[PDB]
Amino acid sequence: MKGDTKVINYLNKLLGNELVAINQYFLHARMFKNWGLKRLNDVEYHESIDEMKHADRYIERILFLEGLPNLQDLGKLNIGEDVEEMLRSDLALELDGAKNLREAIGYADSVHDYVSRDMMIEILRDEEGHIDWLETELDLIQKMGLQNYLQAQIREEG
Amino acid sequence: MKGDTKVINYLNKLLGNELVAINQYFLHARMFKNWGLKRLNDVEYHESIDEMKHADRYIERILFLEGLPNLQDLGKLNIGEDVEEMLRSDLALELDGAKNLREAIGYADSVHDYVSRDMMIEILRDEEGHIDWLETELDLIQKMGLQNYLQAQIREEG
Amino acid sequence: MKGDTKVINYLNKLLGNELVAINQYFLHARMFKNWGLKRLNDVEYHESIDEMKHADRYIERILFLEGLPNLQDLGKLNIGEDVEEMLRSDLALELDGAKNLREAIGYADSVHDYVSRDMMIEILRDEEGHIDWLETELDLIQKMGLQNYLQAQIREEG
Amino acid sequence: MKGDTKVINYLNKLLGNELVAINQYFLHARMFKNWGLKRLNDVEYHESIDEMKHADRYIERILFLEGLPNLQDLGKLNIGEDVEEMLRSDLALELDGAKNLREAIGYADSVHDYVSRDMMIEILRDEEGHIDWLETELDLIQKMGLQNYLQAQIREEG
Amino acid sequence: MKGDTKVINYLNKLLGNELVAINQYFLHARMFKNWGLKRLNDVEYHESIDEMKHADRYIERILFLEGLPNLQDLGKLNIGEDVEEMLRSDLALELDGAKNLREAIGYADSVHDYVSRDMMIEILRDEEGHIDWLETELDLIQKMGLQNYLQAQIREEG
Amino acid sequence: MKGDTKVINYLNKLLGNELVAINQYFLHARMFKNWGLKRLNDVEYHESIDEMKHADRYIERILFLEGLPNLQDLGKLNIGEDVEEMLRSDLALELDGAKNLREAIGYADSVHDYVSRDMMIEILRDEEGHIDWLETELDLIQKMGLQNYLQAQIREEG
Amino acid sequence: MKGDTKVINYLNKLLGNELVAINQYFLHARMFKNWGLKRLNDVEYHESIDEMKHADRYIERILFLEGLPNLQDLGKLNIGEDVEEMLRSDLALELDGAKNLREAIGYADSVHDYVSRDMMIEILRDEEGHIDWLETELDLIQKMGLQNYLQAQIREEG
Ligand code: HEM
Ligand code: HEM
Ligand code: HEM
Ligand SMILES: [Mn+2]
Ligand SMILES: [Mn+2]
Ligand SMILES: [Mn+2]
Ligand SMILES: [Mn+2]
Ligand SMILES: [Mn+2]
Ligand SMILES: [Mn+2]
Ligand SMILES: [Mn+2]
Ligand SMILES: [Mn+2]
Ligand SMILES: [Mn+2]
Ligand SMILES: [Mn+2]
Ligand SMILES: [Mn+2]
Ligand SMILES: [Mn+2]
Ligand SMILES: [Mn+2]
Ligand SMILES: [Mn+2]
């Protein structure tokens, strides 16, 4: 079905954001894994899989709307050297994505693409949830201290 | 454990190949899906997941060997406009990867990194398997004709 | 138990026929498999296993009758280059075997070896069944056309 | 996929070895069976089926590598007249096959056909296992004496 | 089957390494157990059992190859007085074994003993895995501090 | 808890005996296995595991009693060249161990270490049981003759 | 049955020791419980129940031996004010009981009351086990520090 051109560009810009989040969350998960920090490996791997699934939703909507998914442009990953710096790059990436999402949702709404808009509010709701996890971890590091925080990651939660 | 520097570069060059195969196989799967070609969507999606799992094996080996995984450089995707052109870009990508793998396996062997070498022979064995599927499909297109070939893709196999 | 010498030679001549049918049906099954023609791989592999089991019945009867099984002389395989030519070499091999069987059954009967005779009528009944499958396929190729025939082989029957 | 010509010849030379092992192990199994030596019939029949499955692996690899399987040339079977002579022909055949395999594995490795090479190391591992069984039986015949050895074969093991 | 003499010596040298690892890992497990450090007792006991099973693989290969297993020469155990010193003697023993293994694998390969070679790459892969556990523990001790590290060992993981 | 010094030395002398029994019973089991003598492999492997478990009981008692387990001194193994010679070295080792145990039990009793004493009477009871098996086998070899005895070992008991 | 008078007095002296251990372990369990230290409540409550069951064994043996159980004399409880002081009073009580037990076991043995003697070696074995737990806890308090030790007691082990 023929979509609005500027909705298709927002969808590609947003898909482009997911492509860096997938790679950055996946490499952080495996870095935490290699350090023995199992709980951090499991939560970050899951966030990686969520972004994978978001990228898949945009690829499919762009194709239905008769656009072309751009999987060729990868933005700049910010890895970090320690646990706290790694969790802050992630919080910062999420905060930018949420910002681009707010803008795209408002545009899709103004051109009456209500289905693309609802897709994006669902993805925004998942991003606000990752933002909540990252903020609480970063605070817990300050409150219990890094050595206590690292000790809490070596066994997995349920 | 400290790995050989040139083994760590081969592992990153190879990881870099998987990153384009993941994106190119995933976008081809979803293009076939949008066209109604369900069987082709299912096989190409599975190949995408295999490359995902290969990329994960290299990320973990590079980290143990004390190197840094490069998830920042994405090579050039070659998408294609029709079914046959899409399957040929995939066969060509696989044929190059197999070529780089043969070279890396030989080097890892000469520096006695037998575990990195065996990991790569396993991945090479999976790639030869994707090469076999792609070659047979491309031949079947010539033998039964494209309209018959497209008709065979609209329901999924088991 | 001491068998009739000429019955033991018919049994070896017939065993010799099964040894080429086993190899020719097995190589055709794997050729069809490599071409993507799964239904043809499954039926020809099964015919190969039937001939295997026939060869086993003759080996055991020749040994009871105090003869020596000849597994050393392999006749000339006629492979074929395409689907239709491959199925016609098979039909032709079966038609010759059935001819040698008719002759051996009549001889075993005239020397009163009724058990060797009944063994051979059972094997003849299986060969007439392979002849029926091969003839119907060769006719279906003419009636629906080769491209339609090849399309029907890519998924397996039940 | 196009294979190295000399790898395809080693694969055919090896397939040719399996074709005599299949026939020689199968006829020995049925000879032991006719003599009442059930345990020897069961182990030799199983070795026959293993060679069958090895021959199938080579036929499929040669076809993928774009060669032609040679199922037309059967080498010379060495049957034997008694139990010990029969088991020694088998040990001798296995010892030759292992020798040709060592040579082919080294060549496949030097042309970087690591998947054909690994296939052959797996088959070599099964052949070393048959070599172990045959050597132990031949020693047990000397240690307990032939009449005791024959008595041990009349019921099947588990 | 008659093996290469120098392969049989590498196999005995390597068996000799496993005999000290078995005793050193077993005594460390029981020392950690006596100190209340249950998680460390369980992981080190399991490593002890792996070495037991490796020693068993070499004993059986040397016997098939017609050599004699040397279970009479025990090298020098390095026990350690505290947790960190104990884990570093283990890391150091593993690093030496891996070094002797790399050398033996290359020799077995050059004499074409591909089955003894593959046995050793499998054992090398298990040793690289123990090396990974030991390195991560030694780093976690530095990152969370010894009192936090000791507190994490008093209950067992799953 | 602080143990008596001479009790801790008896416990180490005894642990030292178990370390040769473990290695001598394990190598005899695998030699019988390689010869085809399965029943003898299973019983001797089990005796090896019992000694393993005895060595573990002494290591743990010495540690509680505040001593140091000596796993560094391995005595002289007496392997043997044939079945009967191998079983007699085992009977002789057991007979010595039982002798050292009788002496240690009496000493532990005189210093009132009743728990170390009871541990040792339990281990003595297991050793008298291995002595019974070895004596009966050695007699059965004389009564039925070696060729009959070897024939009885080729299948496993229950 | 009429017992030896001095065996009956040792049995009452020992029963008298269990009566203080029951009360001291039970009050310590409930004190740890009230402080939130659940793991310490569970282990000390179980030790209390073991002493209960020991007191029951002595009451029954004294009655069979025709003596009178003395449940009227309670010795002096040493409670303690903090966690470490409480665990040391317990270790000290156990160490005295073990001392009286060693003496009684030797006397019962010299008058040939082998059944009363074996009853007491079983109880001694349980007391050495409580001694092991108490010593390891007291060391863990020094090694991980009291605040880490108290944090580890707030959830129960399995
Ligand atoms: C173009 C970007 C990618 C897309 C669109 C994508 C999509 C997916 C999807 C849809 C799944 C299945 C999710 C589910 O469980 O329901 C998946 C799984 C997975 N992906 Fe990706 N992925 C991408 C990139 C990557 C990369 C770079 C890696 C990193 C190595 C990766 C690793 C994985 C892994 C390990 C799994 C789990 C596979 C399994 O065992 O099932 N993916 N991905
Ligand atoms: C002397 C000729 C041969 C005889 C007498 C023979 C006999 C047999 C028999 C009795 C079986 C078991 C049939 C059943 O399932 O009940 C069998 C299975 C089989 N044979 Fe043969 N065979 C012969 C040659 C071959 C050859 C040349 C190949 C080709 C590679 C082959 C491949 C197989 C395979 C793949 C199976 C199935 C094995 C399994 O997975 O169970 N056979 N054969
Ligand atoms: C010549 C060296 C040794 C060899 C070849 C050896 C081999 C084995 C094998 C094959 C097993 C069974 C593994 C399984 O669970 O699958 C085993 C178990 C065991 N070994 Fe050893 N072992 C050796 C020395 C020792 C020593 C010195 C000790 C230390 C006291 C020991 C203690 C044990 C224990 C406790 C088990 C578990 C037994 C059970 O409950 O099943 N082993 N060993
Ligand atoms: Mn997202
Ligand atoms: Mn997110
Ligand atoms: Mn790949
Ligand atoms: Mn691939
Ligand atoms: Mn037939
Ligand atoms: Mn037929
Ligand atoms: Mn074979
Ligand atoms: Mn074989
Ligand atoms: Mn090892
Ligand atoms: Mn190891
Ligand atoms: Mn013992
Ligand atoms: Mn014993
Ligand atoms: Mn008590
Ligand atoms: Mn107690």
XYZ file of N, CA and C in Angstrom, chain G:
474
model
N 18.325 -55.945 81.682
C 19.520 -56.753 81.855
C 20.455 -56.010 82.786
N 21.208 -56.594 83.706
C 21.925 -55.794 84.696
C 23.198 -55.209 84.144
N 23.326 -53.891 84.114
C 24.522 -53.287 83.554
C 25.646 -53.071 84.554
N 26.842 -52.746 84.080
C 27.915 -52.345 84.976
C 27.635 -50.979 85.579
N 27.715 -50.861 86.895
C 27.473 -49.603 87.604
C 28.229 -48.391 87.112
N 29.496 -48.559 86.776
C 30.267 -47.432 86.308
C 29.936 -47.035 84.868
N 29.623 -47.983 83.964
C 28.965 -47.673 82.685
C 27.668 -46.882 82.877
N 26.743 -47.319 83.737
C 25.561 -46.506 84.047
C 25.886 -45.103 84.553
N 26.916 -44.882 85.369
C 27.302 -43.515 85.715
C 27.855 -42.708 84.566
N 28.751 -43.239 83.731
C 29.158 -42.549 82.519
C 27.994 -42.170 81.633
N 27.059 -43.100 81.383
C 25.844 -42.800 80.638
C 25.059 -41.657 81.278
N 24.797 -41.639 82.592
C 24.210 -40.451 83.217
C 25.003 -39.144 83.148
N 26.327 -39.168 83.291
C 27.171 -37.987 83.147
C 27.060 -37.402 81.749
N 27.212 -38.277 80.751
C 26.947 -37.927 79.364
C 25.506 -37.436 79.153
N 24.435 -38.099 79.647
C 23.073 -37.566 79.521
C 22.966 -36.159 80.079
N 23.585 -35.950 81.245
C 23.703 -34.634 81.831
C 24.337 -33.614 80.897
N 25.425 -33.926 80.193
C 25.943 -33.028 79.154
C 24.945 -32.711 78.057
N 24.204 -33.700 77.540
C 23.196 -33.427 76.512
C 22.107 -32.477 76.993
N 21.625 -32.655 78.227
C 20.673 -31.701 78.768
C 21.127 -30.239 78.724
N 22.401 -29.866 78.940
C 22.779 -28.472 78.732
C 22.908 -28.082 77.274
N 23.487 -28.933 76.422
C 23.529 -28.691 74.981
C 22.161 -28.476 74.339
N 21.154 -29.306 74.635
C 19.784 -29.062 74.211
C 19.335 -27.648 74.563
N 19.424 -27.231 75.835
C 18.958 -25.904 76.227
C 19.802 -24.783 75.650
N 21.124 -24.910 75.651
C 21.958 -23.883 75.083
C 21.806 -23.761 73.585
N 21.818 -24.841 72.799
C 21.567 -24.745 71.363
C 20.159 -24.225 71.079
N 19.102 -24.683 71.759
C 17.771 -24.150 71.519
C 17.635 -22.650 71.785
N 18.068 -22.143 72.952
C 18.088 -20.708 73.190
C 18.965 -19.941 72.187
N 20.194 -20.355 71.836
C 20.881 -19.709 70.732
C 20.106 -19.696 69.416
N 19.480 -20.789 68.961
C 18.673 -20.771 67.746
C 17.610 -19.688 67.780
N 16.830 -19.637 68.846
C 15.807 -18.600 68.952
C 16.290 -17.157 69.110
N 17.432 -16.942 69.770
C 18.123 -15.662 69.730
C 18.543 -15.280 68.317
N 19.239 -16.133 67.559
C 19.537 -15.842 66.161
C 18.277 -15.585 65.357
N 17.209 -16.344 65.602
C 15.948 -16.098 64.925
C 15.395 -14.710 65.176
N 15.305 -14.329 66.440
C 14.877 -12.984 66.790
C 15.716 -11.865 66.186
N 17.026 -12.067 66.001
C 17.880 -11.096 65.342
C 17.752 -11.045 63.826
N 16.901 -11.876 63.224
C 16.824 -11.921 61.779
C 17.809 -12.882 61.153
N 18.647 -13.574 61.922
C 19.686 -14.418 61.363
C 19.176 -15.841 61.081
N 18.295 -15.971 60.089
C 17.610 -17.226 59.780
C 18.483 -18.451 59.558
N 19.563 -18.386 58.785
C 20.379 -19.564 58.565
C 20.947 -20.100 59.872
N 21.341 -19.195 60.766
C 21.872 -19.588 62.061
C 20.815 -20.179 62.967
N 19.604 -19.631 62.940
C 18.483 -20.282 63.607
C 18.253 -21.696 63.100
N 18.202 -21.950 61.796
C 17.975 -23.306 61.319
C 19.053 -24.288 61.681
N 20.336 -23.990 61.484
C 21.375 -24.939 61.869
C 21.387 -25.157 63.368
N 21.273 -24.135 64.226
C 21.319 -24.372 65.664
C 20.100 -25.116 66.171
N 18.897 -24.827 65.682
C 17.735 -25.646 65.998
C 17.937 -27.124 65.673
N 18.473 -27.457 64.487
C 18.790 -28.839 64.173
C 19.778 -29.441 65.132
N 20.851 -28.754 65.500
C 21.744 -29.297 66.512
C 21.053 -29.567 67.834
N 20.170 -28.673 68.257
C 19.324 -28.915 69.406
C 18.544 -30.211 69.290
N 17.798 -30.428 68.191
C 17.103 -31.705 67.943
C 18.048 -32.929 67.958
N 19.248 -32.899 67.362
C 20.218 -33.989 67.539
C 20.539 -34.306 68.989
N 20.715 -33.282 69.825
C 21.009 -33.544 71.217
C 19.824 -34.144 71.943
N 18.639 -33.641 71.638
C 17.408 -34.285 72.060
C 17.361 -35.782 71.775
N 17.585 -36.132 70.523
C 17.709 -37.533 70.160
C 18.858 -38.284 70.823
N 20.066 -37.733 70.999
C 21.068 -38.359 71.851
C 20.579 -38.570 73.285
N 19.991 -37.567 73.959
C 19.493 -37.732 75.313
C 18.523 -38.900 75.388
N 17.626 -38.995 74.384
C 16.728 -40.148 74.267
C 17.430 -41.491 74.156
N 18.505 -41.646 73.381
C 19.282 -42.877 73.367
C 19.875 -43.227 74.714
N 20.469 -42.290 75.458
C 20.996 -42.600 76.781
C 19.893 -42.981 77.751
N 18.756 -42.250 77.811
C 17.622 -42.612 78.680
C 17.180 -44.055 78.456
N 17.015 -44.449 77.207
C 16.665 -45.819 76.908
C 17.737 -46.841 77.245
N 19.027 -46.609 76.992
C 20.065 -47.552 77.388
C 20.170 -47.677 78.893
N 20.150 -46.580 79.662
C 20.202 -46.645 81.123
C 19.046 -47.465 81.666
N 17.807 -47.230 81.218
C 16.666 -48.055 81.603
C 16.866 -49.540 81.266
N 17.283 -49.967 80.065
C 17.555 -51.379 79.769
C 18.601 -51.999 80.685
N 19.669 -51.239 80.944
C 20.741 -51.652 81.828
C 20.381 -51.627 83.300
N 19.124 -51.321 83.601
C 18.569 -51.307 84.937
C 19.030 -50.193 85.850
N 19.428 -49.078 85.250
C 19.819 -47.918 86.005
C 18.704 -46.897 86.056
N 18.931 -45.744 86.667
C 17.960 -44.661 86.654
C 18.436 -43.407 85.943
N 17.803 -42.920 84.873
C 18.232 -41.733 84.155
C 18.137 -40.532 85.074
N 19.187 -39.728 85.125
C 19.106 -38.487 85.855
C 18.771 -37.301 84.981
N 17.491 -36.920 84.982
C 17.061 -35.704 84.289
C 16.844 -34.531 85.236
N 17.435 -34.579 86.427
C 17.195 -33.569 87.443
C 18.333 -32.571 87.560
N 19.569 -32.970 87.267
C 20.708 -32.059 87.307
C 21.129 -31.357 86.018
N 20.828 -30.067 85.954
C 21.181 -29.274 84.789
C 22.455 -28.488 85.061
N 23.508 -28.662 84.268
C 24.722 -27.870 84.435
C 24.613 -26.403 84.047
N 25.731 -25.689 84.024
C 25.639 -24.267 83.788
C 25.748 -23.939 82.315
N 24.695 -23.273 81.853
C 24.590 -22.813 80.479
C 25.503 -21.632 80.280
N 26.251 -21.517 79.200
C 26.972 -20.285 78.926
C 26.447 -19.615 77.651
N 25.527 -18.659 77.784
C 24.802 -18.087 76.654
C 25.603 -17.201 75.718
N 26.326 -16.202 76.180
C 26.954 -15.269 75.258
C 26.040 -14.115 74.874
N 26.700 -13.031 74.492
C 26.031 -11.771 74.191
C 26.002 -11.393 72.717
N 26.996 -11.846 71.955
C 27.015 -11.657 70.514
C 27.201 -12.932 69.710
N 27.022 -12.861 68.393
C 27.150 -14.009 67.505
C 28.409 -14.831 67.701
N 29.568 -14.198 67.688
C 30.815 -14.921 67.843
C 30.987 -15.574 69.204
N 30.657 -14.869 70.270
C 30.694 -15.418 71.611
C 29.730 -16.587 71.799
N 28.517 -16.487 71.240
C 27.580 -17.599 71.227
C 28.138 -18.820 70.498
N 28.639 -18.696 69.268
C 29.260 -19.831 68.588
C 30.475 -20.410 69.311
N 31.354 -19.611 69.939
C 32.415 -20.151 70.773
C 31.935 -20.872 72.018
N 30.908 -20.458 72.782
C 30.411 -21.311 73.868
C 29.959 -22.658 73.395
N 29.280 -22.694 72.245
C 28.916 -23.959 71.650
C 30.115 -24.805 71.284
N 31.118 -24.276 70.573
C 32.318 -25.050 70.295
C 32.978 -25.586 71.551
N 33.086 -24.755 72.585
C 33.630 -25.216 73.853
C 32.826 -26.314 74.531
N 31.487 -26.227 74.608
C 30.665 -27.313 75.124
C 30.892 -28.605 74.355
N 30.947 -28.544 73.017
C 31.134 -29.738 72.212
C 32.479 -30.391 72.477
N 33.526 -29.578 72.517
C 34.846 -30.054 72.874
C 34.940 -30.748 74.239
N 34.299 -30.251 75.295
C 34.143 -31.017 76.528
C 33.369 -32.312 76.468
N 32.229 -32.311 75.785
C 31.469 -33.535 75.609
C 32.297 -34.592 74.913
N 32.987 -34.199 73.836
C 33.820 -35.144 73.114
C 34.879 -35.754 74.026
N 35.507 -34.916 74.843
C 36.386 -35.375 75.908
C 35.738 -36.343 76.885
N 34.603 -36.075 77.514
C 33.947 -37.091 78.331
C 33.568 -38.364 77.583
N 33.114 -38.239 76.331
C 32.818 -39.401 75.504
C 34.004 -40.313 75.286
N 35.168 -39.754 74.915
C 36.380 -40.550 74.759
C 36.715 -41.392 75.976
N 36.586 -40.799 77.151
C 36.762 -41.508 78.403
C 35.729 -42.601 78.626
N 34.428 -42.307 78.496
C 33.396 -43.322 78.653
C 33.505 -44.477 77.658
N 33.813 -44.208 76.382
C 33.943 -45.257 75.366
C 35.022 -46.257 75.770
N 36.211 -45.764 76.136
C 37.280 -46.593 76.674
C 36.877 -47.408 77.894
N 36.194 -46.841 78.882
C 35.687 -47.664 79.974
C 34.676 -48.728 79.552
N 33.634 -48.390 78.787
C 32.671 -49.385 78.354
C 33.350 -50.548 77.649
N 34.335 -50.221 76.827
C 35.137 -51.230 76.162
C 35.862 -52.145 77.136
N 36.555 -51.604 78.132
C 37.240 -52.432 79.116
C 36.351 -53.337 79.948
N 35.136 -52.940 80.320
C 34.172 -53.890 80.869
C 33.402 -54.732 79.836
N 33.760 -54.762 78.548
C 33.064 -55.531 77.523
C 31.615 -55.172 77.224
N 31.210 -53.939 77.525
C 29.890 -53.494 77.137
C 29.983 -52.928 75.726
N 30.243 -53.784 74.746
C 30.406 -53.371 73.362
C 29.221 -52.641 72.742
N 27.969 -53.012 73.033
C 26.812 -52.268 72.545
C 26.738 -50.845 73.102
N 26.887 -50.582 74.422
C 26.961 -49.211 74.961
C 28.118 -48.460 74.350
N 29.277 -49.096 74.199
C 30.382 -48.500 73.486
C 30.078 -48.075 72.050
N 29.541 -48.950 71.205
C 29.152 -48.538 69.863
C 28.120 -47.423 69.820
N 27.113 -47.431 70.692
C 26.201 -46.294 70.821
C 26.926 -44.964 71.013
N 27.900 -44.955 71.924
C 28.700 -43.774 72.190
C 29.602 -43.402 71.019
N 30.278 -44.296 70.290
C 31.025 -43.898 69.083
C 30.152 -43.246 68.019
N 28.909 -43.720 67.830
C 27.935 -43.035 66.974
C 27.588 -41.635 67.404
N 27.269 -41.436 68.674
C 27.091 -40.093 69.200
C 28.376 -39.275 69.054
N 29.583 -39.811 69.311
C 30.831 -39.065 69.127
C 31.026 -38.585 67.710
N 30.696 -39.441 66.759
C 30.726 -39.066 65.366
C 29.796 -37.912 65.064
N 28.559 -37.861 65.564
C 27.738 -36.666 65.418
C 28.324 -35.428 66.072
N 28.901 -35.529 67.277
C 29.559 -34.391 67.931
C 30.753 -33.871 67.148
N 31.644 -34.719 66.625
C 32.696 -34.229 65.744
C 32.197 -33.472 64.529
N 31.060 -33.891 63.990
C 30.376 -33.126 62.959
C 29.882 -31.763 63.410
N 29.289 -31.594 64.606
C 28.951 -30.249 65.061
C 30.198 -29.402 65.291
N 31.245 -30.003 65.866
C 32.523 -29.327 66.009
C 33.021 -28.809 64.654
N 33.024 -29.608 63.590
C 33.376 -29.095 62.271
C 32.564 -27.897 61.785
N 31.238 -27.903 61.915
C 30.437 -26.758 61.527
C 30.846 -25.546 62.345
N 30.857 -25.631 63.689
C 31.213 -24.480 64.510
C 32.589 -23.884 64.189
N 33.634 -24.703 64.065
C 34.943 -24.207 63.647
C 34.939 -23.505 62.311
N 34.335 -24.066 61.266
C 34.277 -23.379 59.991
C 33.538 -22.045 60.089
N 32.410 -21.935 60.795
C 31.748 -20.648 60.933
C 32.636 -19.621 61.610
N 33.240 -20.001 62.733
C 34.131 -19.094 63.418
C 35.272 -18.635 62.530
N 35.868 -19.469 61.692
C 36.830 -18.999 60.705
C 36.279 -18.117 59.616
N 35.114 -18.423 59.079
C 34.498 -17.593 58.071
C 34.218 -16.185 58.580
N 33.789 -16.034 59.841
C 33.647 -14.720 60.471
C 34.948 -13.930 60.378
N 36.109 -14.505 60.749
C 37.398 -13.825 60.570
C 37.685 -13.564 59.090
N 37.572 -14.529 58.180
C 37.905 -14.286 56.788
C 37.048 -13.288 56.008
N 35.711 -13.318 56.081
C 34.908 -12.372 55.314
C 34.504 -11.131 56.101
N 34.780 -11.128 57.400
C 34.397 -10.004 58.224
C 32.992 -10.150 58.772
N 32.722 -9.669 59.973
C 31.402 -9.771 60.555
C 30.255 -9.190 59.743
N 30.289 -7.990 59.190
C 29.162 -7.490 58.400
C 28.808 -8.346 57.197
N 29.773 -8.775 56.393
C 29.545 -9.819 55.409
C 29.045 -11.136 55.985
N 29.625 -11.667 57.066
C 29.069 -12.837 57.711
C 27.617 -12.645 58.120
N 27.219 -11.563 58.795
C 25.821 -11.360 59.163
C 24.926 -11.257 57.954
N 25.280 -10.538 56.907
C 24.508 -10.542 55.674
C 24.276 -11.927 55.094
N 25.233 -12.840 55.151
C 24.995 -14.191 54.659
C 24.020 -15.030 55.476
N 23.566 -14.604 56.649
C 22.690 -15.442 57.438
C 21.231 -15.121 57.289
N 20.867 -14.098 56.519
C 19.499 -13.602 56.556
C 18.515 -14.343 55.679
N 19.022 -15.200 54.803
C 18.191 -16.084 54.002
C 18.592 -17.513 54.295
N 17.705 -18.498 54.262
C 18.199 -19.842 54.514
C 18.821 -20.601 53.346
N 19.920 -21.289 53.673
C 20.568 -22.245 52.763
C 19.723 -23.491 52.407
N 20.112 -24.147 51.309
C 19.780 -25.543 51.015
C 21.004 -26.281 50.417
